[PDB]
Amino acid sequence: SEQSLNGRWTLKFFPQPAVPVMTIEGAEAANGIVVDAVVPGNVEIDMEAAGLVEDPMVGNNIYKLRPYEGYQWYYSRTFAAPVVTEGQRLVLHFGGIDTFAEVYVNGIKVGSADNMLIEHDYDITSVVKEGENRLDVIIRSSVMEAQNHFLGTLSIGNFSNEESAPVRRAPSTYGWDIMPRLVSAGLWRDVTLRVENPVTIVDANWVTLSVNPKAREASESLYLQTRLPFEMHDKVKAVITISRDGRQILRKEALMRKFANLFTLNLSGVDAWWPRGYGEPALYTAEVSLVDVTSGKIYDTKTSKIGFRTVKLELDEQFQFIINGEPVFAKGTNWVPLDALHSRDASHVEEAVQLMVEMNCNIVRCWGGNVYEDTHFFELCDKYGIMVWQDFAMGCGNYSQRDNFAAALEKEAISVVVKLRNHPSLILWSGNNNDRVSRQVLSRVIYEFDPTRPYLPSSGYYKDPFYTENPSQFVSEIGYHGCPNRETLERMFSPDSVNPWQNGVVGMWNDEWQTKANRIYDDKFQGGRNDLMTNQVRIIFGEVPADLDDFIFASQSVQAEAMKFFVELWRGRRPYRTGIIWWNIRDGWPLLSDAISDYWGGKKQAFYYMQNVHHDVCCLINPAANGYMLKVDNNTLKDFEGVVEVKDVASGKQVFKGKFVSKANQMSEIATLPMQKGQGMLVISYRIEGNEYFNHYLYGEPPYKLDQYRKWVKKCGIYELE
Amino acid sequence: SEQSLNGRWTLKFFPQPAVPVMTIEGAEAANGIVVDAVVPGNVEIDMEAAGLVEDPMVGNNIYKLRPYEGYQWYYSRTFAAPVVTEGQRLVLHFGGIDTFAEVYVNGIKVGSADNMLIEHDYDITSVVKEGENRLDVIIRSSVMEAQNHFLGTLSIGNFSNEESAPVRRAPSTYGWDIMPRLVSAGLWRDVTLRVENPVTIVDANWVTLSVNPKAREASESLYLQTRLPFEMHDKVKAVITISRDGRQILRKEALMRKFANLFTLNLSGVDAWWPRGYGEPALYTAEVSLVDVTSGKIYDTKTSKIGFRTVKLELDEQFQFIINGEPVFAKGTNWVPLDALHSRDASHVEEAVQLMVEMNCNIVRCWG
Questions:
Q1: B87 interface with A at CB cutoff 8 Å
Q2: Rounded Cα–Cα distance for residues A146 and A140 (Å)
C-alpha cells in the first residue's frame, strides 16, 4: 500500500542568518512566524492564505515577495508509520523539494536534498518508531546558496541569472522576459509513504525494438530490474501482460532466476503509435508483476500505457524526424512554465495540453528554463499524439566544467531519463547549449540509459528576408508580441493603469505595464521590451492607436498575421522545410508577452489564426510577385480530395473555384491566382469529407489601414473581433 | 585593514622520522635545533645567518645542503587577533608554503598545504582567541613525499627529477642543467592577516571586449563576484572608476541586486596597450568599490592597472601573435628562476626586468 503524506503541514519561516539553520533544535529555537501550509504547495500560497502577502499577479506586487528569497522554511508534520513485516522496506518519497534542505525522521537525518527538479527517496525502515513519527524538513535560501561557488567567466553576464548557474533549479524562477522573478520554495509535489516487499520491482524499461504498422506487428523489449532475495530465486515468476481496453493480447510468464532480465515480446495484432495526423496514438496497457510460484502472492506490480513506435533523427548532409520509418513534418509550440508557483502546475496541465490539442500540434518542446513536467503531462501527450522534445534544465548561459557540477547533473540526468524513457511521446533529449555538460555528461547518460532516443547537444516585418530567406529546414524558436485581451488587462492591472499610456502620451508605458513586460527587478525605466509592441504595430498599420481597444486589436492582428505567415511559409515550402516550433502557446504568469494565450486562458487572436493553418490538410497561399500561389499541405499518411474556393473580400469577386487532390505527407500546388490590385484580403473556403474549413490571405504591402483590415476580418466571416 | 604576519618567526628543524610529524605535541617533543627565522624566507638563509651552513653559491658547498632534504621544519609565531564585528571574516593568507605542511591556529588545524606554487587562504574567524594567538606550521620533507606515489613509466628517466613528478613544486628546485639542486623549504612569500566585511569583493575580472586604437575607444567588461548578505541586496552599489594619472575618465554606479554581475564599459578617449616598439604601454587605473547606498560606507575596494588590448594566436595553415589586429614580431628571452632560494626572487624582480627593458624585449616566456 501507499500512504499519502499530503495535506496540512506546519510551516515556520524566518530570515536566514549568517550560519544557515541545519538542525531541528536550531529551527525550533529561531525566532520565526508559524502558518498552516498545504503540501503540495508553495510558501507564498500559504502566506497569501494567511493575509501576509498580496496577490503577486496584480500590479507591481511581484516585487513585494523580494525579502522572502533570504528566508528559511521549516516544514514539519506527524505521520503514522505502518507496521512492516520482516524483510519489507519503508520508503519516504518526495516528488519535489525546493530546494536545499535537511530531512529528519524522529530527530534523525535521513538525507540532504539539493535538486528542485528530481524526486528524492529515502529508506526510513530503521529510524521509524511505533505509532506517530515526526517528519521535519529545514529548507534554506536558494539565492544564498549561489555564494558557496566561484563562477566561471562565461557563467556571468548571461540572460539566465548568475544565481542559477551553480544550483539545480529551474532557471526561469530567478526571472526571465516571459516569466516573473519568484524563486519561492516548498514541497511542491507529492509526499508519500511506500511499503515495499523484499521482492519488488526496481525499474521496468519498455523499449520498442521494431514496428511493422501495416502488418500490425511489433517487437517490444522489457528491461526489468528487481530486488530479489536469494532465497526467492527460482521461486518468483514475472507475469507480463499486454492489453487494450481490457482485452488481453499477450501474456508471458517466466521464472525469475536473476534480479535483472530482458524479455522480448513479439506482438501481433497491435497498432503502432503515431503523432497527430499521421495516424492514431495507439496505446496499450503494459503490466509486469512478480508472483510467487507456490502461494501465488503478488509481491509488486508496475502498470503503464506504452506505444509501439520507432524514432530516428536524420541529420541532413537541418534535420527531419522519422517516426515508424516515415518522415513527419513537426508543427508545435514551446512549453514554458505553467505557473511561477510551480506547485500549481499539476492543476493547469490538463487544460494547457488541450490548448495544443485544439491547435493540432504534433510536437512540443519543453523549454530548458522550466522544470521537468511530471508523469501526468507525458501520459496526456501519449494519448493525444503530441511528440515531446525535452531539453535538459539549463538556460541561456554556459555552465561549469568542474566535477561537482557534472556529478550533480549526472545524478539529475539519470533520474529524469529513467522516469520518462517509457513514454512513446518522448522522442528527443537536448542539451539546449568542448562543453563537458553537453558533449560528455548528458551524452554519456543517454548512451547508457536510453540508446533508443536521439540526443542533440544544442538546438520587424515578418516578410523581411531575415525570416523569409532563413535557410534552416527546422526552425526551433520564433515569436511576435501580442497585447492580451482587455479582460486580462483589467484583471492584472490597477484600474488607473489598465490604459498603457502614461499621461495619455502614446508610446510611454506606465510603471505597471513596464512590470509585466517582464521587468525582473524593480528598476524604473522607460521603453525596453514593451516597445516591441508599438514598433511592430507601427510597421504594419502605420501609426499606434491611442484607443486601448484599437491598440489591442492592432497588436493582436500583427501577432496573428506574423505567426500565420511563418507557418504557411514553412508548410508551403515542403519538402525542403521539415518542421516548425513556434513560441509560444501559453503564458505561465499574468504578463504582456509573445504567447498566443494568457495564464487565465484568454486566447489572443493569433490562436485562432494559427489554428486554421495547423489542420492535417490545409489550403493556404504563399506570396509571389506573380501573384498568389494556392497550395494544400498534408501532414497525414492518407490522400484527401476536396473543393476549394477563393474570393476577394472587399469586392466579393470569385478568384478561383475547383477541386484538388492532396497527396499524403506532401505539399501539392492547386493553382496560381491572378494578382489583385492594392491591398485586400482573400477568403479561402474548402470542404473535405463533409467538413468545412476556412483560411485567408492578406495581399498588398504594409502599411495597412487598421479600420480597413478590421472590416475585411469581420466580412471574411471566420474570426470575431471580440 | 590588513595586518602583516611577516617578520621574526621561530624555526625548529630535525630529521624526519619514518612516521612524519603531523601534530604540535609531536613537533615540540621531537629532538631538534631552534633558530630565529625571517619570513618570508628560506630555511637555508636562516641557517647561514646562524653560521650553521656555508655559502652554497661558492665552490662545491651546494652539495653540503644535501642532508637537509630529509628534515622537517617547524614554524611558529604569535600574533594579535584584531577585534572582529559580527558578520566579518578573519582570513589567514599564505603567499608561499614550501611545501607539504599542517597549519594550526590555537592548537586547532585550519588546513593542510600541498602546493608550493599557489596561495593558501584559511578562515580562522571561529578558532581565534582574544589577544595573542599561536600560529604553527609543521612542514615535512618534500623529497620523501614522492615515495607516497607509484610513478608511471614515462614519468621515470626524464630530465626532470622523478621526485618532481607527483608533487606540485617547481621542477628546477630538484636540479637542472641551469639551476642547482636546492629543494629547500619555508614560508617564501608574504603571510598576512585580513579582515573582510560581510560585503566583500571575491573577484574582479577585467576583460577587453574590443579596442579601436585609432578611434581611442575601447569596450571593457567587468565580471564581478562579491559576497553579499541577502539583507544587503538592493542596498549596496558598485562604484566603478577608470582613471589615468588621477584624471577621471569614466565612473559607473549600479545597484547590487545579485552577488555576481557583468558591467560593460564603453570607453572613449582611452589609449590601447601595446608591446614595446608597436606603441605605448598605456595603462589605466581600474577601481571597483562596494558602497552602502544609505550610509555611504565603503565595504571593499579592488584596484589595479588594466590595459585595453586584444590577443589572437594565428596558427599558420608556425604561428604569429596578433595584438590589437596587428601582427607583431616577438623578440625576447626565456624567464628562468631568479634564485634557487625562491624567497629572494622578489628582491631581484625589478633589476631583472630592467635587463629585458635594456634588451628591448617585447615578449618573455616564463619557463615551466
A1: yes
A2: 12
Contact B45/B39 with Cβ under 8 angstroms? Answer: no
Documented resolution in Å: 2.5
Nearest to A578 by CA among A429, A386, A362, A368: A362
- Give every strand in the sheet of B298-306, ordered side by side: B247-255, B236-244, B284-292, B298-306
Task: Say how far apart CA B57 and CA A313 lie, in whole Å.
Answer: 71
- CA A567 to chain centroid, in Å, comes to 20
* CA dihedral for A519, A523, A527, A528, sign (positive or negative): negative
Cell digits of residue B177: 642543467
The single residue listed with the C-alpha cell 623578440 is B331
Task: Decide: A660 and A632 in contact? Cβ < 8 Å.
Answer: yes
Method: X-ray
Instruction: Determine the distance in angstroms separating the CA of A408 from the nearest CA of chain B, rounded to an integer.
Output: 22
CA atoms within 13 A on the CB side of A192: 11
**Helices A548-572 and A531-541, packing angle to 10 deg:** 80
3-state secondary structure chain B: CEEECCEEEEEEEEECCCCCCCCHHHHHHCCCEEEEEEECCCHHHHHHHCCCCCCCCCCCHHHHHHHHHHEEEEEEEEEECCCCCCCCEEEEEECCEECCEEEEECCEEEEEECECCCCEEEECCCCCCCCEEEEEEEECCHHHHHHHCCCCHHHCCCCCCHHHCCCECCHHHECCCCCCECCCCEECCCEEEEEECCCEEEEEEEEEEEEECCCCEEEEEEEEEEECCHHHCCCEEEEEEEEECCEEEEEEEEECCCCEEEEEEEEECCCCECCCCCCCECCEEEEEEEEECCCCCEEEEEEEEECCCCEEEEECCCEEEEECCEECCCCEEEECCCCCCHHHHHHHHHHHHHHHHHHCCCEEEECC
What span, in angstroms and rounded, lies between the C-alpha atoms of A389 and A332? 10
Peptide bond just before A99 cis, omega within 30 deg: yes
Tell me the C-alpha distance between B81 and B210, whole Å. 46
Beta-carbon contacts of A84 under 8 Å, excluding residues fewer than 6 positions away, are A90, A125, A195
User: Would the CB atoms of A146 and B227 count as touching at under 8 Å?
Assistant: no
Contact flag A153-B223 (C-beta cutoff 8 Å): yes
Q: Which three cell numbers stand for residue B359?
A: 634588451
- Residue with cell string 512590470: A515
Q: Which ranges in A363-424 belong to alpha helices (H)?
A: 375-384, 403-420
User: Which helix (H) or strand (E) segment is A144 a member of?
Assistant: helix A142-145
Other Cβ atoms less than 10 A from the Cβ of A617: the count is 24
Given a contact cutoff of 8 angstroms between Cβ atoms, the answer to whether B74 and B24 are in contact is no
Among B203, B255, B262, select the one facing A157 at the smallest CB separation.
Answer: B262
CA nearest to A185, candidates A30, A65, A51? A65
**Spacing of C-alpha B242 from chain mean position:** 25
Query: Can you tell me the distance from the alpha carbon of A650 to that of A640, in angstroms, rounded to the nearest whole number?
Result: 31
CA nearest to B254 within chain A: A523
- How far is CA B201 from its chain centroid? 17
Of A143, A156, A521, the CB nearest to B230: A143
Which residue, chain included where needed, has cell 498568389?
Answer: A628
Residues 6+ apart with CB under 8 A from A470: none
Q: Residue type at A84?
A: V
* Distance (Å, whole) CA A159 – CA A399: 13
Contact: B233, A70; criterion CB under 8 Å: yes
Cell representation of residue A229: 532475495
The interface residues of chain A toward chain B in range 3-32, judged by CB-CB distance below 8 A, are: 15-16, 18
CA distances from B118 to A105, A212, B7, B173, B188 (A): 44, 64, 21, 16, 11
* Contact yes or no for B230 and A144 at CB 8 A: yes
